[PDB]
Amino acid sequence: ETLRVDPTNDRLSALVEIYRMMRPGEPPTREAAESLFENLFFSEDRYDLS
Amino acid sequence: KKRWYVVQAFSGFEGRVATSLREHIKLHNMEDLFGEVMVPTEEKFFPGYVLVQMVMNDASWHLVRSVPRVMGFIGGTSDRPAPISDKEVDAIMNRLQQ
Amino acid sequence: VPLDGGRFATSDLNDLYRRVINRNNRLKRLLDLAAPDIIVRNEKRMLQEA
DNA sequence: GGGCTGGTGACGGCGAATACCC
DNA sequence: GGGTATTCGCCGTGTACCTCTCGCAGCCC
RNA sequence: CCGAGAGGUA
């Protein structure tokens, strides 16, 4: 049911929608979406469980 | 053809914003996508706005907003921000010349 | 109020009125010297928000 | 010497603003 | 083109009193 | 002699 509510279809559209829910109302770019989603959870700088 | 745009900075750090903007241009070497950077001055209007000769790609837009101490462009919308005008650029250059 | 240290920790109202008068004087000067209309739209937005 | 410049453990009620469905 | 349903923001949460500390940096004009 | 923040009495 979750995948039936999804409008997205590939990696790029998902990264665009996540970049759009983070910072509202601005043009996304594939480099900016990759950089944001790698700096949310997957970087030693901005994310750190102890 | 490169048209003009208005950038808002933290008012007071404007010369440092202009220098950092020129340096980010010569770092990310989009040299064919930037013409000048104006901060006009009388013996200082405009109080906190930086004029940029530019073109509009989303890469150059992210470049100017990734320059530090820059809030954003000032236009009708944030998708396609707004250039100003022909005669308005000519009058600003007129009073800068005068 | 004086705090007996050579300085005045001001009340919040004088800060607010000072912000409105700063922004209004800058808007009078920008309507004086024929600023481009995008900048006076931004300046009026700032005055409304102050 | 000094001017001025911009977090992420509260919960219920309630009414206004969408929403969807026919 | 309305009749019910779900979201979204606001409004609100006891009274007196006592003691203490601390209240805007930056900076190159 | 105003506001915060902390503590305490009933």
Side-chain angles (χ1 to χ4, degrees):
Chain A
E1 295 291 328
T2 302
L3 288 171
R4 290 185 190 275
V5 178
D6 282 329
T8 59
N9 205 2
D10 56 352
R11 183 181 184 270
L12 176 62
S13 179
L15 293 175
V16 164
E17 181 65 31
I18 294 169
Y19 183 77
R20 188 173 292 167
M21 71 161 285
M22 287 300 292
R23 296 183 181 180
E26 70 183 3
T29 311
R30 182 174 176 85
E31 289 84 3
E34 287 178 355
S35 297
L36 186 68
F37 186 70
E38 294 292 325
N39 287 320
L40 285 176
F41 300 112
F42 300 94
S43 176
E44 294 288 330
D45 194 3
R46 288 183 176 90
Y47 190 82
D48 190 71
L49 268 70
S50 69
Chain B
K1 185 178 184 293
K2 295 179 182 179
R3 299 180 64 237
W4 291 93
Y5 289 96
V6 173
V7 186
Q8 183 174 2
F10 287 101
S11 64
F13 302 107
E14 183 178 1
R16 270 75 57 90
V17 165
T19 299
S20 296
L21 175 60
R22 288 181 181 271
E23 292 296 325
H24 276 281
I25 293 161
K26 292 179 181 178
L27 286 174
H28 292 287
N29 65 12
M30 293 180 182
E31 184 178 358
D32 294 331
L33 305 180
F34 288 95
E36 288 180 351
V37 47
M38 284 181 180
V39 173
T41 298
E42 279 236 356
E43 290 175 350
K44 186 178 180 179
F45 63 96
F46 297 147
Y49 295 103
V50 178
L51 276 73
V52 172
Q53 183 177 2
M54 200 179 73
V55 297
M56 184 53 67
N57 287 319
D58 288 330
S60 67
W61 179 70
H62 284 92
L63 180 58
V64 181
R65 282 177 62 96
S66 67
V67 170
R69 288 176 290 178
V70 166
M71 295 179 186
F73 289 163
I74 301 302
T77 187
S78 68
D79 293 331
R80 293 177 181 269
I84 45 175
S85 290
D86 195 4
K87 64 181 181 181
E88 293 176 354
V89 167
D90 287 332
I92 292 168
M93 288 176 65
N94 193 2
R95 288 194 301 271
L96 180 63
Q97 187 175 2
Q98 187 178 3
Chain C
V1 286
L3 59 88
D4 289 330
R7 67 182 70 186
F8 287 98
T10 184
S11 184
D12 300 334
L13 294 175
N14 294 319
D15 197 4
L16 291 169
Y17 281 104
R18 191 181 69 184
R19 189 172 301 181
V20 174
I21 295 163
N22 283 318
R23 186 66 69 185
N24 193 5
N25 285 319
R26 287 169 59 191
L27 200 148
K28 283 184 180 179
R29 189 182 67 194
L30 288 174
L31 290 181
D32 191 4
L33 277 76
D37 292 333
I38 286 94
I39 294 173
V40 299
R41 286 180 186 177
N42 193 11
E43 200 74 23
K44 290 179 185 180
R45 180 180 65 84
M46 290 295 176
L47 190 145
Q48 180 73 44
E49 190 171 359

